[PDB]
């Protein structure tokens, strides 16, 4: 969805995925959060795809946030192409996940409301987050 | 000079009224002028500006030098270049060879509503000024003023006091 | 294509002795196309802008000038 | 562009080899150096 508007290196490496959260490992500008107890390569369409559902349940609230920005120009290859002879096409944008990653900020949110579209994002994220307070 | 003496002895009261008393050797004091065409305009030939350098040798502060712009403007393609508008950068007792023009000749010649420039706030006790034409300085100006190519006039005190600078120039010659 | 079969030939950068050794007069100290360390007595900066000795002796390091240095202390 | 040598008065008719600006400047190169009897300079010339 939302794209880093300027990039000095349009290809990256695949990176790594080790251990524990780096920073932003607590809830900063929300009341509620969802700890990523796992680690994957979450895709921007999947994230905002959760976020309109978060508008659907979470109808009239303000500063309810996701935390990350998708930083990674993730790149796949095609059908029948052999191994190498160049590197392929930047299909889109992804952010990394670590274990212990807080991802969500929630403001103006009730406790009973504070599990629901969140609980849909349990079905809209490929990671195992859970409910977190401050 | 003449305004050395009437300067110091006429500011000995304004010493006490304004900021510092008892700093009797070092009170606020003027510094210099700079007098420049600064027109830009060099891209046509630069030679008409090289008669503005004879306009600055004509007003005759000192040797009419010129400056090079740091970057050469794409909207003006001038390729940095030394002719841009003239430079003096005149100071001291030569200023005191220059101010009686300013207070009893120059703007009292051009008669343009006592030349109010209260906008000239340079932050710290300095004061800008400009001019469009100069029919100033008799028997020097005429027969080449078919267009005065301009000049700018910036006075500067040693003091950082803007209003005491207003009382320092406007002490003598020019109200604003 | 890639335009990336364009190649760089790496070469040896770094230290030679680095620790107080009785390094020969006029012998190589530290290869530098770019100076991290900075010279001293009995030490020349090269045409290759390395550090090269002039007189034997211990070649320990010094934090002069808030900066990294090599002279050669004799004996 | 740029290719020249350097002669002298005798020097075996040629002493140095340099090209400095044979298309930009295009006047003359005049360089005093040492001859085969170095220990004294002479003023030196161009091919």
């Amino acid at each position: 969805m939302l794209v880093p508007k300027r990039v000095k290196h349009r290809r990256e490496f695949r990176g790594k995925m080790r251990g524990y959260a780096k920073g932003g490992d607590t809830v900063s500008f929300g009341e509620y959060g969802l700890q990523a107890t796992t680690s994957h390569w979450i895709t921007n369409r999947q994230i905002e795809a959760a976020r309109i559902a978060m508008t659907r349940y979470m109808k009239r609230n303000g500063q309810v946030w996701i935390k990350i920005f998708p930083h990674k120009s993730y790149t796949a290859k095609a059908i029948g192409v052999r191994m190498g002879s160049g590197k392929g096409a930047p299909e889109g944008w992804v952010a990394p996940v670590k274990r212990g990653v807080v991802m969500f900020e929630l403001g103006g949110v009730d406790e009973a409301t504070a599990r629901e579209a969140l609980r849909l994002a349990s079905h809209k994220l490929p990671v195992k987050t859970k409910f977190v307070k401050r | 000079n003449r305004l050395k003496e009437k300067y110091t002895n006429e500011v000995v009261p304004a010493l006490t009224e304004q900021f510092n008393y008892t700093s009797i050797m070092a009170v606020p004091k003027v510094d210099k002028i700079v007098i420049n065409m600064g027109v830009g305009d060099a891209v046509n030939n630069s030679k008409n500006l090289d008669k503005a350098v004879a306009e600055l040798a004509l007003i005759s502060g000192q040797k009419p030098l010129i400056t090079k712009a740091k970057k050469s403007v794409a909207a003006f393609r001038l390729r940095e270049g030394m002719p841009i508008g003239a430079k003096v950068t005149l100071r001291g007792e030569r200023m005191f060879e220059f101010l009686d023009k300013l207070v009893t000749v120059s703007l009292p010649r051009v008669r343009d509503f006592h030349g109010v420039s209260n906008k000239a706030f340079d932050g710290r006790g300095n004061y800008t000024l400009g001019v469009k034409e100069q029919l100033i300085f008799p028997e020097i100006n005429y027969d080449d003023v078919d267009k005065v190519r301009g000049m700018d006039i910036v006075i500067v005190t040693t003091a950082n006091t803007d209003e005491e600078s207003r009382e320092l120039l406007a002490k003598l010659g020019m109200p604003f | 294509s890639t335009s990336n079969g364009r190649d760089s030939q790496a070469k040896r950068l770094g230290a030679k002795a680095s620790d107080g050794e009785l390094v020969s007069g006029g012998s190589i100290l530290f290869r530098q196309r770019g100076t991290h360390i900075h010279p001293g007595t009995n030490v020349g900066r090269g045409g290759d802008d390395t550090l090269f000795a002039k007189i034997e002796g211990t070649v320990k390091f010094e934090m002069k000038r808030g900066k990294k240095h090599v002279s050669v202390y004799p004996v | 562009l740029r290719k020249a040598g350097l002669a002298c008065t005798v020097c075996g008719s040629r002493n140095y080899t340099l090209n400095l600006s044979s298309v930009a400047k295009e006047k003359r190169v005049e360089v005093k150096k040492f001859c085969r009897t170095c220990g004294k300079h002479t003023l030196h010339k161009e091919t």
Partner: protein, 79 residues
């Protein structure tokens, strides 16, 4: 100073007569020339006899422009 100023200060044989208040030196105009008139290369009259108050913002305060302003645009008994 430069040495041997090939720029100006050149002496036109004239006078910076009264209330420009200058005489003649290696000098060319205005506020520069000298301070005396009691020997007189030429004599001090040719420019002007009235001072910086020759500026008509203050010439006996220069209220000779008055009267103007309130007869603009009507103090009259016509119509």
């Amino acid at each position: 100073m430069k040495q041997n100023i090939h720029p100006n200060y050149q002496p036109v044989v004239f006078m910076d007569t009264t209330t420009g208040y200058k005489f003649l030196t290696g000098s060319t105009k205005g506020s520069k020339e000298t301070v005396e008139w009691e020997d007189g290369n030429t004599y001090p009259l040719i420019r002007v006899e009235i001072s910086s108050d020759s500026h008509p913002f203050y010439t006996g305060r220069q209220k000779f422009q008055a009267a103007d302003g309130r007869i603009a645009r009507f103090e009259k008994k016509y119509g």
